[PDB]
């Protein structure tokens with residue numbers, strides 16, 4: 001077959017009932033995740049290959065970066081609660097990996113302030129139980145699939161994208177192959 005289990009994708013040994021249709025996991029410490037955001041725009045290109053209105057979910061993970069890695073999962077919960085993901089994704093990636101100006105929770109908060117989120121607004125979200133639940137939700141989704149590597153994408157709780165089986169001599173071909181695979185999996 002053109003698409004084969006073990007090539008462009010793998011099949012979860014224990015499917016995840018009730019999982020989101022397209023689920024991405026990333027870390028702001030993750031070098032390929034930086035590329036998936038700034039150079040490849042994987043999420044945008046996958047969205048354009050799926051039908052209008054399908055839900056795509058993107059969660060942060062704890063297992064990279066120690067203390068700050070957990071602070072970033074909580075900050076990503078704030079970003080989701082406030083709806084400001086598009087305002088903070090690039091500054092957080094660059095603060096961690098390019099300028100290395102993010103060394104503490106205060107530095108993370110600075111990124112949101114500079115992006116125009118009010119201080120009182122950020123701190124109330126940071127300390128809220130709604131954000132505690134969003135942190136728990138991100139942890140539970142990663143736990144459900146025994147996640148040990150990012151960037152990862154899962155389709156309908158059953159299939160995991162295998163980008164190591166995609167050719168990377170041409171970045172646009174790679175993005176297209178990745179998005180076409182998601183579309184194929186979503187239609188199974």
Ligand SMILES: COc1ccc(Nc2ccc3c(CC(=O)O)coc3c2)cc1
Pocket residue numbers: 032035036039040149150151152163164168171
């Ligand atoms: C800069 O553009 C790019 C970006 C990425 C790649 N290849 C690549 C290879 C392996 C993985 C894994 C699995 C893992 O190691 O956990 C996740 O994502 C990957 C991406 C090639 C070119």
